[PDB]
UniProtKB/Swiss-Prot annotation, chain A:
Protein's cellular compartments: Nucleus
A Pfam family matched in the record: Spt4
C4-type zinc finger segments: 15-35
Assigned GO CC terms: DSIF complex; nucleoplasm; nucleus
Binding site for Zn(2+): 15, 18, 32, 35
Protein name: Transcription elongation factor SPT4
Swiss-Prot record, chain B:
Upper lineage: Eukaryota, Metazoa, Chordata, Craniata, Vertebrata
Keyword entries, A-Z: Acetylation, Activator, Isopeptide bond, Methylation, Nucleus, Phosphoprotein, Repeat, Repressor, Transcription, Transcription regulation, Ubl conjugation
Gene that specifies this protein: SUPT5H
GO terms for MF: chromatin binding; enzyme binding; mRNA binding; protein heterodimerization activity; RNA binding
GO CC, any one term: DSIF complex
Protein name: Transcription elongation factor SPT5
Swiss-Prot record, chain C:
Protein name: DNA-directed RNA polymerase II subunit RPB1
Subcellular location: Nucleus; Cytoplasm; Chromosome
Gene name for this UniProt entry: POLR2A
Description of its domains: The C-terminal domain (CTD) serves as a platform for assembly of factors that regulate transcription initiation, elongation, termination and mRNA processing.
Role this protein plays: Catalytic core component of RNA polymerase II (Pol II), a DNA-dependent RNA polymerase which synthesizes mRNA precursors and many functional non-coding RNAs using the four ribonucleoside triphosphates as substrates. Pol II-mediated transcription cycle proceeds through transcription initiation, transcription elongation and transcription termination stages. RNA-dependent RNA polymerase that catalyzes the extension of a non-coding RNA (ncRNA) at the 3'-end using the four ribonucleoside triphosphates as substrates. An internal ncRNA sequence near the 3'-end serves as a template in a single-round Pol II-mediated RNA polymerization reaction. May decrease the stability of ncRNAs that repress Pol II-mediated gene transcription.
Domain of life according to the entry: Eukaryota
Organism, scientific name: Homo sapiens (Human)
UniProtKB/Swiss-Prot annotation, chain D:
Primary location class: nucleus
Residues of the full protein shown: 61 to 617 of 1174
Biological processes annotated in GO: transcription by RNA polymerase II
UniProt binding sites for DNA promoter: 315
Keyword field contains Metal-binding: yes
Name of encoding gene: POLR2B
Function: Catalytic core component of RNA polymerase II (Pol II), a DNA-dependent RNA polymerase which synthesizes mRNA precursors and many functional non-coding RNAs using the four ribonucleoside triphosphates as substrates. Pol II-mediated transcription cycle proceeds through transcription initiation, transcription elongation and transcription termination stages. RNA-dependent RNA polymerase that catalyzes the extension of a non-coding RNA (ncRNA) at the 3'-end using the four ribonucleoside triphosphates as substrates. An internal ncRNA sequence near the 3'-end serves as a template in a single-round Pol II-mediated RNA polymerization reaction. May decrease the stability of ncRNAs that repress Pol II-mediated gene transcription.
Subcellular location(s) of the protein: Nucleus
Protein name: DNA-directed RNA polymerase II subunit RPB2
Assigned protein family: Belongs to the RNA polymerase beta chain family.
Amino acid sequence: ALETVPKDLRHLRACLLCSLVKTIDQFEYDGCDNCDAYLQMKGNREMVYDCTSSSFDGIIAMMSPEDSWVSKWQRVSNFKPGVYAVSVTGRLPQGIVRELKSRGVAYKSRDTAIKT
Amino acid sequence: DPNLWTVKCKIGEERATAISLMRKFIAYQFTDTPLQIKSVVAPEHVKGYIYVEAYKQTHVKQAIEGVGNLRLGYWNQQMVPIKEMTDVLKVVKKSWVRLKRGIYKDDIAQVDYVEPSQNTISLKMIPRIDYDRIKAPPQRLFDAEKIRSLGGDVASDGDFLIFEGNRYSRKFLFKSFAMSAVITEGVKPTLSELEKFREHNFQPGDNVEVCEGELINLQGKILSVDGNKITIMPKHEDLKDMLEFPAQELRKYFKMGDHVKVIAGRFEGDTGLIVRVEENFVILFSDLTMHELKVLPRDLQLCSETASGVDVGGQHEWGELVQLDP
Amino acid sequence: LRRNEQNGAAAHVIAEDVKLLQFHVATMVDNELPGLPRAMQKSGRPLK
Amino acid sequence: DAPPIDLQPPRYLLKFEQIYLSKPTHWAPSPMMPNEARLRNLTYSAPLYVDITKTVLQTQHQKTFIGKIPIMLRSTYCLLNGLTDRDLCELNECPLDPGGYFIINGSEKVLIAQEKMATNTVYVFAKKDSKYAYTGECRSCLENSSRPTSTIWVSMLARQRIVATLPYIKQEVPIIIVFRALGFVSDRDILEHIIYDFEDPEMMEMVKPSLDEAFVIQEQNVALNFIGSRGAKPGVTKEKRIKYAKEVLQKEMLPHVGVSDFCETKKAYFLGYMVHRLLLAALGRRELDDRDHYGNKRLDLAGPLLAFLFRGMFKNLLKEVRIYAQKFIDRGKDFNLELAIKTRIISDGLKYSLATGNWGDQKKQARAGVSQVLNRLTFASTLSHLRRLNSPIGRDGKLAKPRQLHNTLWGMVCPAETPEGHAVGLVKNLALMAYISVGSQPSPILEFLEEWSMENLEEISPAAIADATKIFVNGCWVGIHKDPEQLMNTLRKLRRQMDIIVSEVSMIRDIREREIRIYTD
DNA sequence: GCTCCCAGCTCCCTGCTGGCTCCGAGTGGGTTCCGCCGCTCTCAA
DNA sequence: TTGAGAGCGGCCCGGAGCCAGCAGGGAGCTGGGAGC
């Protein structure tokens, strides 16, 4: 909804897991809208900087993921509606990847861009 | 699956139009007239028109009947081929910089000191100023004495000087400029810029030799040329088989007594006959000026059109009469 | 077109700009064409 | 007539209501002598103002400069108005000069009158070269119509039916299904609208193929769907095709008789009038029309020309103003009126158009030769070039008839004054007594009719139109009356005394075919 | 009861009607004309 | 420091072939049934 919708173009950066494109203000105020329980995004800034990538190429406005071939392509059909990124350039830290693997959520990279 | 429709918008405002239309969808999604489209696509390398992912052109029209930036596409929208989905979705990818804005656009500037604040960096730059004489511009050296004589907005601190809206110079402008306003990648200043502050060029018809490998010392004519690894097709002497060689393996070797040309350098544009080919130094007598030129095989080139005998500017020929003084 | 086929190759801008380049060379052949409108200059006069 | 511009978001509308014309004045505000203007290569242009009424909260902005508009010499707002010979020779201008010409950039320019086809009048001509047997054309245009004139064609096919050629229509639609789309699905009132005197068996055998072809559609909505079909913007289904048909029937079908649901029956009656004219043309009881009749040609002066050009480029100016205000309301800032108005886009466009003589804004093609340079060689030469008339029929052609000398020129144009070169006969020079009608509003005339006893067409019974005589004003049909006698005489004497009927407005009483037409145009 | 002359079929082919380019005699002389919009820094108040 | 200006930078009919659409003969194809 409007909480997921960004309010301004300044300091736009996308998440590393769900590729959610939201600003720093609503990362600080609300954190993630998809895997906030699996990431514990609230209450810190350095870990949010580590868990988000400031370089993203292209955005997609998926809001009906159950009937979207684009959502099936980027495997975001099971996620909540919002603003998502096609390509996210980055990687989670090894400890966060290992604790996500221990909790049972395998980290799949969103870097779908073709590197040369 | 919904299809993509091209709708035309104002150039440079596609992202703002997309933000405005999705905000309108937010404002009117709970109303009696929701937008039945699925999504919109605004590629970063596509300017002039955007894509609407929707089922019907009527739905596209009902989406784009908002801000007047989409009027020329509100007249008519076009369809995208089904195989073009992937091609739409694909995304393709003590220093020197160049300035973006101002009167100093596209000029080489030497980043001397880098501020750790990541906001501005100090640049040594050649001033394109008239020293407050014409304005009430080619590159030239800074003249502190001349600008002090002309006066105006000027502050003298020996070698350091401030003029014309906090323009700082020392001995050469030394001014802080924005990180977003400078380009730190893909500058590559030349030797003239180095004084102020590899390459492969093979052409068909030329003869190149192989100096290494099991096919050592083999002279063949150039048929093709590529970027880095050419995989050339050489026409070797007493060899009808068509080999493969890269530019790093090949060397531009020419037989004794042929018309040779200099592609670049001080001796560029000259034609002559070689005298003696050493391992790096090739000496030639040029044709219009029977003069000794010592050039590299890489700088050498073979062609059939001799020297025209005229300057680069097209004003004076060789062996000409001019006025040194009246 | 050369830069776009070198790097982008999205092929839709390629086809559309090739169509405009074809119209441009057709205008070079003849400014007046029954099938397409003639070119226009800022001076207000049709091209020759 | 230009509508107020309204835009949302906070709505606001801006309207122009009062003109403030001023004496010509450049800047230090000082008037220009026409002599010194033409010597300094200036123009004799007068400042123009309007007042602005905005309602965002009502704001009034009086005396707002639009631009400078050219004035010809010796006009009612010129400096050379009322000055005698002594005053004029003190002001170093010739007292014997006639005046009435524009001076642009110092250059001396004179408009040449253009001759045009008559407007809002049915016209029948021989069309044997085409597939049709006969054609009746009507150029429909309202007085101060923002859209340009349209043309309605009705055609008798050569073979035997009747179809129509309509604007924004790619097909030839039958008249009966046009009547059914209008709403008259009854054969009885279709017949009673296409004829006035019911006893017409010759009409029976020359109308029977059209209705005997078109009876199969009997529904107004089906007919409107057919109108929407084969159109410029056809609907996918009957939905919005009925809307396209309705807007064609309103805007495009006879705007000169009015555009309303109340005017729809007047449209039907007048369409019956043109098809009645076509039937009498086919019978030959009524003689056909000639394009060479200067009674059926009108003569445009600079007034209608300048009014039309100013209308179009004022619409362009309003487009610029509304897009400027839309840009500021997109930016979220209040629009500025003085930066919204463009003295350049009004005054420079008018000056370029008038100086060049090309009848466009900047590019348009456009008709040239509308204004030329006055031949200051002889007083007689100046008078001839001032009283010169232009027929815009195609020069450098073999079409003999429109450049032939016609009978209808006794006292209108001197016969023995023509150019000699490639265009002989398309250019005329005005005779002595000949004067052009200035034009007047016909509303007091219609009030005279209705205070008198000439009933409108909508209240009168249909069958009791057979005996009476038709009454048209400026071509469009107004009503009927039983006895045109003594009211023709009343109109003549009232025209003579200029009490309510002016001397300029004319009236013609066809007694061979029972009608009378009033021309205020 | 299956070929084969024949009948119906069925493509087969030459034979009739529409949108459409392209043309439209010889010199002087005068007048008008060839961006606009965008956009960032300089000096002024 | 901010505001607007100067200048750089980008955006009226003619003929006549002529193709295309359609319409009538025409032999092949395979049934129809006459013949053996």
